């Protein structure tokens, strides 16, 4: 029964909830097990980076997040093609590939291919037979310069272009931002019906004289 002022509450506890209760007493144990697995994997892939393959620079989808940028699943085939890396050799040398990702614009394409070229420059390649260095790398730069990389490879970072203070011009002072926004909304709203009315007026015009 309600009692004086209060919030109308609707608990979702009518469905025998006590048979399905997930306690978290194994959370510290799970963290320990995950850390042990991470360390074992890092030991298994000894000089290779612990986090794994390099990931592409990827802009977040919706209008809420399109100002941010993050790491994607894998580099696109167009990026690999213009960077000169085979799509079957990239995974061997540690480059994640995403065959189902497309490149709508050219700026993201170019950013990801400079990322690929920078990674390829920073890559140290061990020959299959250490006694027979065929085409990988010189032994000088892989004897002591080889080191397991901790953290994501070339972590994706949001960059901000700083604009220096400048003199405001008369055109910028005379721009009407609110009026422009209102008129743009009105034009986008009435674009179709204006076209239909113009079409009807043209129909009347092409036969007004008879």
């Amino acid at each position: 029964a309600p009692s004086r002022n209060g919030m109308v509450l609707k608990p979702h506890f009518h469905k025998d909830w006590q048979r399905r209760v997930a306690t978290w007493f194994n959370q510290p144990a799970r963290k320990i097990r995950r850390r042990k697995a991470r360390q074992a994997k890092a030991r298994r892939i000894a000089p290779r980076p612990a986090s794994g393959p390099i990931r592409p620079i990827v802009r977040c989808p919706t209008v809420r997040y399109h100002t941010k940028v993050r790491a994607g699943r894998g580099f696109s085939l167009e990026e690999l093609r213009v960077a000169g890396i085979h799509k079957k050799v990239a995974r061997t040398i540690g480059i994640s590939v995403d065959p189902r990702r497309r490149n709508k614009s050219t700026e993201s394409l170019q950013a990801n291919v400079q990322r690929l070229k920078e990674y390829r420059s920073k890559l140290i390649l061990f020959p299959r037979k250490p006694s027979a260095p065929k085409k990988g790398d010189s032994s000088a730069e892989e004897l002591k310069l080889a080191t397991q990389l901790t953290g994501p490879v070339m972590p994706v970072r949001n960059v901000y272009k700083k604009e220096k203070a400048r003199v405001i011009t008369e055109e910028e002072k005379n721009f009407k931002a609110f009026a422009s926004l209102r008129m743009a909304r009105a034009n986008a709203r009435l674009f179709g019906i204006r076209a239909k009315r113009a079409k009807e007026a043209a129909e009347q015009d092409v036969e007004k004289k008879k």
Binding site: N5, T62, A165, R166
Partner: protein
């Protein structure tokens, strides 16, 4: 701490603070929000008006991200840059005005509450309100739009 509760003081009193006449029974009045239109109608009308009925248009598959548009007021506008920026602009001999990117700071619309200090500034925003634009123009600034 169970030692700080009324149960430790209600030992020895037969009804445990629930009365001898009305007692403490299972569910007098119903369970939950029962009888909100019949025998709890006075409580519901008194404290939760508008509770019953439908108002407005329903919209399937609402995506909050589409309508995401955080706002910032002009009184908090200058807090988005460093103090160095404002003092340098104030003491600048030339009429150079700093650029404030509220989209960079995480805001899409600039609202017009408050007042601005008397110094020009360029403001980059997705949307502006009419009074915000007027107050920015008043101090000799400019409003520029971004997408």
């Amino acid at each position: 701490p169970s030692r700080l509760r009324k149960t430790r003081k209600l030992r020895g009193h037969v009804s445990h603070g629930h009365g001898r006449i009305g007692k403490h029974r299972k569910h007098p009045g119903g369970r939950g929000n029962a009888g909100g239109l019949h025998h709890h109608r006075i409580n519901f009308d008194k404290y939760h008006p508008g509770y019953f009925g439908k108002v407005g248009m329903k919209h399937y598959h609402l995506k909050r991200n589409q309508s995401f548009c955080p706002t910032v007021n002009l009184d908090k506008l200058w807090t988005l840059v460093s103090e160095q920026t404002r003092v340098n602009a104030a003491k600048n001999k030339t009429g150079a005005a700093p650029i404030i990117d509220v989209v960079r700071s995480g805001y899409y619309k600039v609202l017009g509450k408050g007042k601005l200090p008397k110094q020009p500034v360029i403001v980059k925003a997705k949307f502006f309100s009419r009074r915000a634009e007027e107050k920015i123009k008043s101090v000799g600034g400019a409003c520029v739009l971004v997408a």
